[PDB]
């Protein structure tokens, strides 16, 4: 969804429900 940063999904931001 969108995505702009380096990835915004690895371990911390990983998640679509809440995150």
Swiss-Prot record:
Domain of life: Eukaryota
Protein's cellular compartments: Cell membrane; Postsynaptic cell membrane; Basolateral cell membrane; Endoplasmic reticulum membrane
Known outcome of mutating residue 11 to A: Loss of basolateral sorting
Effect of residue 6 to A: Loss of basolateral sorting
Motif Basolateral sorting signal: chain residues: 5-11
Outcome of swapping residue 11 to L: No effect on basolateral sorting
Associated pathology: Prune belly syndrome: A syndrome characterized by thin abdominal musculature with overlying lax skin, cryptorchism, megacystis with disorganized detrusor muscle, and urinary tract abnormalities.
Function: The muscarinic acetylcholine receptor mediates various cellular responses, including inhibition of adenylate cyclase, breakdown of phosphoinositides and modulation of potassium channels through the action of G proteins. Primary transducing effect is Pi turnover.
Quaternary structure (record): Homodimer; the dimers can form tetramers. Interacts with NALCN. Interacts with TMEM147.
Family in the record: Belongs to the G-protein coupled receptor 1 family. Muscarinic acetylcholine receptor subfamily. CHRM3 sub-subfamily.
Name of the protein: Muscarinic acetylcholine receptor M3
Record lineage: Eukaryota, Metazoa, Chordata, Craniata, Vertebrata
Gene: CHRM3
Full-protein positions shown: 271 to 289 of 590
């Amino acid at each position: 969804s969108g995505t702009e940063a380096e990835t915004e999904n690895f371990v911390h931001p990983t998640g679509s429900s809440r995150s």
